[PDB]
């Protein structure tokens, strides 16, 4: 049935979408905005301009077919960005060094319809299968599960491209557990994890969740589209009605768990005064041949009842206190948005022994009024 907290689907009087006047010129396309933003975001992070150009070339190659839609009077509200734009910029810090820059996109049809959009989203993967650095076999093996006869009205599939400092790009896909409806979501996930060779670990997680506050809504199944030992399967669990201590304890099922770290992050950012507008999410990672989740990353919502400026102040302060580059985070937010609540979540994984702390941001371009 779709995400209850972030709207997406056909634009109409019931789902209006209005361009902010002072952003891109009349006639500008989403791809125009994304290219400009991608460049400015690389610069704000001190990344090599050559790598930014490579990122732009890659985005045009893979998404240009669908992303050259007009910013003005869009026919579809996308899920990928909180303002409804069909692209979202993200920066990720894994310990020290230059941040990874990611863009996540949705491919819409002309005109945008559920069936058209699902066709486009899966046609994107066929195009991606021609790219030497992509491994699309594992996701195309799931197409019959996630691409039914009649998609639901709020269908989505999202595609990520990561630009890494001094390294080859990484590709990711995000799939909708609700593709065949809410009722079918558990069986769709069970079957997908079977096909991906991580059934035991998944069912182990299910059993664990049943005893630790419950498995809230599964928000997404994501795959790293690489043929490497680093590639993972990822499941995003949204935690309605759980307190911060319980979310922390729930993560103990995963390797690398650091008791107390999740609860502290939630207290420092989301706060304990007002429930957030949407619940936190834990992303559990899986690897074929490992019987438990290999990692857990917390997705932290911005605090309710507090201005966005304070949300950014808290998030930056939390970053600093983890030894990460908060200045880069603030610069990236400015570059990506051109005051406005355009963040999605902020992601955090504490450093396990021998490891590095991780923090990531996810920011809409602010093309549309909230």
Residue numbers in the entry: 2 to 339, 344 to 375
Passage from the reporting paper:
Heterologous expression in Streptomyces lividans TK21 and an in vivo analysis revealed that TleC catalyses the ‘reverse' prenylation of the cyclic dipeptide (−)-indolactam V (1) at the C-7 position of the indole ring with geranyl pyrophosphate (GPP) (C10) to produce lyngbyatoxin A (2), with the C19R configuration, as in the case of LtxC15. MpnD also catalyses the ‘reverse' prenylation of 1 at the C-7 position, with DMAPP (C5) to yield pendolmycin (3). The overall structures of TleC and MpnD adopt the ABBA-fold, which consists of ten antiparallel β-strands assembled into a circular β-barrel, surrounded by a ring of solvent-exposed α-helices, as observed in the structures of indole PTs and aromatic PTs222324252627. In contrast to typical indole PTs that exhibit broad substrate specificities towards the prenyl acceptors but with strict specificities towards the prenyl donors, it is remarkable that the indolactam-specific TleC and MpnD exhibited unusually relaxed substrate specificities towards the prenyl donors and accepted different chain lengths (from C5 to C25) of prenyl pyrophosphate in vitro.
To understand the intimate structural details of the enzyme reactions, we solved the X-ray crystal structures of TleC and MpnD as the apo structures (at 2.0 and 1.6 Å resolutions, respectively) and the ternary complexes with (−)-indolactam V and a DMAPP analogue dimethylallyl S-thiophosphate (DMSPP) (at 2.1 and 1.4 Å resolutions, respectively). Furthermore, the overall structures of TleC and MpnD are highly homologous to each other, with a root mean square deviation (RMSD) of 1.9 Å for the Cα-atoms. MpnD is also quite similar to these enzymes, with RMSD values of 2.9, 3.0 and 2.8 Å, respectively. In contrast, MpnD showed 109-fold higher activity for the C5 over the C10. In contrast, the rotation of the corresponding Tyr80 was not observed in the MpnD structures, because of the steric hindrance between Tyr80 and Met159. Moreover, the significant conformational differences of the loop between residues 166–174 in TleC and 152–160 in MpnD (RMSD of 1.9 Å for the Cα atoms), and the lack of a residue between 157 and 159 in MpnD (170 and 173 in TleC), result in the displacement of the Cα atom of the active site forming residue Met159 in MpnD by 1.3 Å towards the inside of the active site, as compared with Ala173 in TleC.
